From a paper:
We characterized biochemically and structurally the opit5_10225 gene product, and show that the enzyme, Op5Man5, is an exo-β-1,4-mannosidase [EC 3.2.1.25] that is highly specific for β-1,4-mannosidic bonds in mannooligosaccharides and ivory nut mannan. Op5Man5 features a 200-kDa large homotrimer composed of three modular monomers. The modular monomer structure contains an N-terminal catalytic (β/α)8 (TIM) barrel that belongs to clan GH-A with a sequence placed in the GH5 family of retaining glycoside hydrolases (domain A; residues 2–364). The A-domain is followed by a Rossmann-like β-sandwich domain (domain B; residues 367–586).
Op5Man5 crystallized in space group P212121 with one homotrimer per asymmetric unit and diffracted to 2.2 Å resolution. Crystals of Op5Man5 grew from a solution containing phosphorus citrate (pH 4.2), 30% (v/v) ethanol, 5% (w/v) polyethylene glycol 1000, and were subjected to soaking with 1 mM UO2(NO3)2. The partial model was then used to phase the 2.2-Å X-ray diffraction data using molecular replacement to determine the crystal structure of Op5Man5. As expected for an exo-acting β-mannosidase, the active site in Op5Man5 is located in a pocket with the two catalytic glutamate residues (Glu156 and Glu281) buried roughly 10 Å below the surface of domain A. All three active sites are accessed from the central void of the homotrimer. Two loop regions in Op5Man5 (residues 103–108 and 320–339) cooperate to form a steric block that closes off the active site to form a pocket. The steric block has been assigned a structural role in converting a GH5-type endo-mannanase into an exo-acting mannosidase. There are no salt bridges formed between individual monomers, and trimer stabilization is partly provided through 17 hydrogen bonds between the B-domain and the A-domain of a neighboring monomer. There are no direct interactions between B domains of individual monomers in the trimer. Two regions in Op5Man5 map have weak, unresolved electron density, and were therefore not modeled: a flexible region in domain A between β5 and β6, including the region expected to form α5 (residues 213–221); and the linker region that connects domains A and B (residues 368–381). The missing regions are located at the surface, on the side of the TIM barrel opposite to the active-site entrance, and neither is therefore expected to influence substrate binding or catalysis.
Numbering used by the authors:
A (entry chain A): 1 to 212, 222 to 366, 381 to 587
B (entry chain C): 1 to 210, 223 to 366, 382 to 587
C (entry chain B): 1 to 210, 222 to 368, 382 to 587
The structure:
Amino acid sequence: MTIDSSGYFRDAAGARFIPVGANYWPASCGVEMWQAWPEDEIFSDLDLMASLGFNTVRFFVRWPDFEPRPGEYDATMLSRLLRLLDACGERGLRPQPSLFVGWMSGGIFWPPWKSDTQNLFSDPVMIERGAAYARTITTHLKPFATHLCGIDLGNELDALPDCSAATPAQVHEWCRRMTGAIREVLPEALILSGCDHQQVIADTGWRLGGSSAPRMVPNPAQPGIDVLTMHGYPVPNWHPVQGSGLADPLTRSLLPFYVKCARAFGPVLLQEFGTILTSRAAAPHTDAYLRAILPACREAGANGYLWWCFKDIPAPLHPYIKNNFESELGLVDIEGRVKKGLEYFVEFARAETQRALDAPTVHLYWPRHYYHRNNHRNPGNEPRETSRRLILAHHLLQSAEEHVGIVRGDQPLPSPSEVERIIITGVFTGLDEIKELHSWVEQGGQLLWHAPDPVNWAQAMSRLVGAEIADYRAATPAITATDEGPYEFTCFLRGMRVRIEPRGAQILMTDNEGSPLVLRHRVGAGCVTSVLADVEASFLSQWPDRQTQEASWSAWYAALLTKD
Amino acid sequence: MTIDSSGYFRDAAGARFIPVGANYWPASCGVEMWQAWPEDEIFSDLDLMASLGFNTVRFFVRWPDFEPRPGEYDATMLSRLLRLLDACGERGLRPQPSLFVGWMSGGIFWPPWKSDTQNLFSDPVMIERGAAYARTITTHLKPFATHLCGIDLGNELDALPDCSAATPAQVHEWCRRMTGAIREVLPEALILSGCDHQQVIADTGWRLGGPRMVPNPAQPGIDVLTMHGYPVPNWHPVQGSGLADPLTRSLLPFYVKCARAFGPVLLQEFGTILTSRAAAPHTDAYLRAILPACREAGANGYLWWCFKDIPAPLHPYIKNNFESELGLVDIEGRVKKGLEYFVEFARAETQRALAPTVHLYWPRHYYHRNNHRNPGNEPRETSRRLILAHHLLQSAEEHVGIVRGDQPLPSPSEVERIIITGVFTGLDEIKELHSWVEQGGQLLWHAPDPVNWAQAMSRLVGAEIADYRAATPAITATDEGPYEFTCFLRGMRVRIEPRGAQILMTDNEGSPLVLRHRVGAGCVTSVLADVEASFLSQWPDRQTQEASWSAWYAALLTKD
Amino acid sequence: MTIDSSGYFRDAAGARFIPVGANYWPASCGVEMWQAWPEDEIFSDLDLMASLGFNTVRFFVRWPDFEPRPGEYDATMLSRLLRLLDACGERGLRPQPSLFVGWMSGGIFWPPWKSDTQNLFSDPVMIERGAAYARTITTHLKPFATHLCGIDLGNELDALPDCSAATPAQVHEWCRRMTGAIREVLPEALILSGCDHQQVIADTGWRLGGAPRMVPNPAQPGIDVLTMHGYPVPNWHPVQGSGLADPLTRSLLPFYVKCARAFGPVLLQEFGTILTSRAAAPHTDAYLRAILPACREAGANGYLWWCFKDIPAPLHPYIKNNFESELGLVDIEGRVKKGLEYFVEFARAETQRALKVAPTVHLYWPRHYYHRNNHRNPGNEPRETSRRLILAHHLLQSAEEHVGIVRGDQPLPSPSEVERIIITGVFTGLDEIKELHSWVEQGGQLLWHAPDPVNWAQAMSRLVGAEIADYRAATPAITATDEGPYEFTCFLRGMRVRIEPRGAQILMTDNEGSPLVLRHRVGAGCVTSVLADVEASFLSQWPDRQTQEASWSAWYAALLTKD
């Protein structure tokens, strides 16, 4: 099992395959599966999966179950593991076993010999016990090595409180150690991270973006990980921009946007996706939601699709008691029937696996230094702040009917024949980034620069924007108008506003009190359009008036975008 | 002493005893009393307390005075304690001595061998010296065991910063050790926590709601719960307006009701803070409201803070000089004008020692720190909503109680009507609520929670979620006027489709806002907005809005 | 050298000396100077400084270059350090070396054997390694003792993350120890802290206001000369000004200097315009002509610009904070940039004035200014306090007052020297209230914005002239002076009290009747008390500054009293 050059899974025989299926816990016992072991129920569920066309099943090796005392592995659980691996094989399902679990449905399930004082990532004993546990489980997977769908490091390790208390360096080291332990048994295994969208919207230490001989791996900030993962749900307050739900185009753009970011750093599996609401009343809306997000996730480059989760789980036990929405996430009801509203996933999965037998018209700028914790070279970017601006720009550009890509500022910029238009959404850019943006613009790039950064505004930025800072001025709102309507910007980058003097640039727009607000500067073959306001922040500050303002928000980008 | 079946003190004679009196430091020296020891002034203050009809005095054994070096107790201080205890008995006053002090009047006073890096609850050495210090003092109290009004563990231990750095489990264990230590000497002593209202409005590890049988197992070895309360606007999570404000006046009875649901409650500290002659018409009216209300909430005793004005020009009265003017009596030994009703009240309660129409819902999981079964409730958030609803309902002439969700719901004969004020409820609570509604209960459910909205919640509310919707304001009207709700639970709104429930009110865009659902013999009225948080968000407009706020509950409340 | 009784440097001959010059890194390499050592370029930059009339240059001994391994001091660096000191004396420039660097231009540069888990101030190994580093470099300085312009302890030690993790007592002891180490080698050296305006606007442990060797500010033991740094950048201050042209922005640096001056001698060790482009030239010129005399009037004893050269070196930290690349005084061809020539002129005038050898209102600096581990502090915190001080200071200057600072941790000067005091809603303990009572009785004129209810007992009642009858809803208070309406939305600690007079007169009421401003004669003086948080209310109206600011100045003028 291997990942091909276009980021797709390949089986031992070198044919491509698209993982499709479900994350799994039995209905009757949820997370207690290893203890309750309702084997007829499990095998009947695997039969149901196979009959729907699924070719993979993600399941969780719950660590306390398997190592109840330090170094003593439960032989009954290991035998149940082997029975499961066997039963999936005979039914055409490639198991995707998840080791470090850990985080699950609102609970946290660790071995009793780990105290809350022992940080999963940094504690010396936990590192050793974790490595031995990874090697032990991998040993028991080795007889199935060619029938796996990768080995999942753990479930949403970036959601753990332990991420706040361990340094990024320590998380990086733990990941190296746990992948290395797996490779002491299966050196060629495909390992997935198991992380969710907090890779994009927070700094948990689980990062997209390093610079690389340990192993050839696409994302060196996650050493030893062959396949990046993305998880995503429509719940409005699980994201830094609050959408309105299943019918909202903003909400629908979130998961494809996350996949697009991940895809820029390596192959990406949509390892978890769900509607959360799955009742009969929700059926018209969940159906339309799925018909939007799944093809968009495909176009964004996902290499596989696993629903959360297979069955409703009426088990009256932790953590389904305190977060009872977790009890009704099944693709399938009690009778083994696909729930009204969700059938499209079945149709899409069958389409995708028969498939396995263009272009973006604008790119959002991902800054060279994205994560802030212990980053001494970062000019001030923070994931939650950057990602709020990227999410909204991404959605509003798609409402202007643009095809939106991501371009990486920590890599040389693609020549303007590949990436022709770049939008910087008020993120902070260092000297090297400016120089490269200059050379890119010189060969013909069209740059739309929202709120260039005064902290990095010296000679280099002045020659690129085409203007010098004459003085600061009060950060009071700027009111203006394009040819389609009026605009008011209340936010400015770092809370500061500047008075500029043109030094090559033309004044494309002024505020209503006469001063320059949008500049336009031609530099070699390209053209820099700079806006002296924090556009995305201003729009986000007027979120309660979203209904009536959104059309003009999106019309803003269209008016200012130029073409060679 | 002993605590009877109804939560009141009993003396050796088996008579009911209602403690009435004051917390005490001397005027001339304040917290330095054990060092300065003005014995004549002290004994004369004890005289005046007795002449006023008091039967209890609360005073503080200040640990640094008694244990200036580890394991070395200061015999001079112990002599002084004996003289004090003797002087109280000779004068008719039951001493309530408070051990771990500690926290006092804006200062913190620990022995000099307790480093700032040594947490009081979790440090191994501190725990052992604490147990040893508690035993030692209880040894010197034993000669008076039949004359104490209980032993007070310490003053407002829940207010210490150490509460923040120690886990709830470590606080629980410290409480078990120290009460266990006292009981090695006086196994039958009545022990009191000494805690204030932060038991309700914060998670300090001093908790209402979970060996020798105690009423409140979260405080192991404690016999009598305590409550402290002052009208200061910004000492509470809802800003009242002071002595004349019915909201501020409802705060202390509210806290007492909450504590009373978990066990017997002494009103161990209450005061007006403002005691000047200019304040006198207002202190008089405030005390006339809260003392009867606290009685009806179930307080079993009343101790004023504090007995004398304290002009002592020393720490901590220099930096918080309002502490210098909390006396019940001036320096001429006269009860301050405006405070006299407390003497009248106390006399009345010791002479006599010879209702709900709706209940507020206290969630099963109240405290968040290291609580893995908690669906999201935090004391400050929950108490905010509870304080406001309690006050609004009392303005609607309702007599409000508290029903505990961590215990089986009483039948609708006892508790007929329940309001859930936008708190988070697990599956087990929903199932128990549904069973209680089945038997006739009337449920007013403000903001049923999407995170626990699956099948059980849908059958009880009588609707399923069709989708989320924008969390924009909901405007509506009852038959008495308009309403606007800007706050929703977890900052999310849902679109519902009915499945058995009627639509009672819509927002002015047509979509359902309030539902009403007959379930068995009872009825669930559900509001799809965070009602209490919305009102609280309109706090600047309280004066013009408060009337409709309490009208809201009156409009929606169901009776059989 | 020595500091005289007025607060000014004096050379060995006993003649007054005003440091004027620049902070320096070479343009080609920036902070890598010790490693790159472009000596020809360095020595000609020193020529340039002397030709401009400067007498002092401030440079930074970067620790990791001078001790790459514990206990082993690089000898090439020590020889380069020596050649640099030679070049300064050979050109009339007094070197001011900075030892603990450390913090520079948005980067942090420590030796590699210091891990990030080792706090500079509290880690025992770092403490002892630091003292040895101090003593070692001081030893290479003492050949030049009579030619230094003091020794600078470090650069903005108070900006370090370590300040948050080390207690104030730990920072205090570290400074005791490091100054002690310098004095082992040069017992009479002039030592400077190297701190900036965070001394005033935060609690970093680097504080104003505390047998040891007598120093002017005991909170910083062993420090002979306090330092101040100041830049116009709007969001580097707790009150957001509008830039080079904003009187508020221009008042900040003098305000910080006046505060530090109330505790000891102050060197304007860093100042700059940040914006130095030719487009900025009209505004830098005007900003410099304002702040430089005003800092002289505030008591600064020297002036060092940041920094001498533009630095295009494409290396850390110029890459992430590229504004740091264009702070030079002179351009690439070596001429003073347009808009900045006034500093050279002001420097030459200060040289001359030194060759030949007014406060109408005082702002109340509370007895307990810093909050960390201060058990006697009634609740003052530097950022809150300085926000109100800065605003009041600027507004009073706009009403054409000359504004001083009076220290509440010292006996109050008699009304002959300090006649009028303004308390800008800060928290006052009992001992401070009695001292204010005695001062007013002697004739003091007190304007008391927001007397603190937490300290409102009998002493405050007697001084204010009123008692608290009750709290009241903290809704806004609307009133009118003879010159316009006012609305106050902010009240101290978010609480509002209903008062009852007891000797005071009701000077002003709110538009619903209740007292708002009181006046109370006490002995020969007079207390005017406002029952609203004046400076916070004005700060809450910052978006409307442009239309509102004049009425804010007029508020102070209306209420200020005389005999």
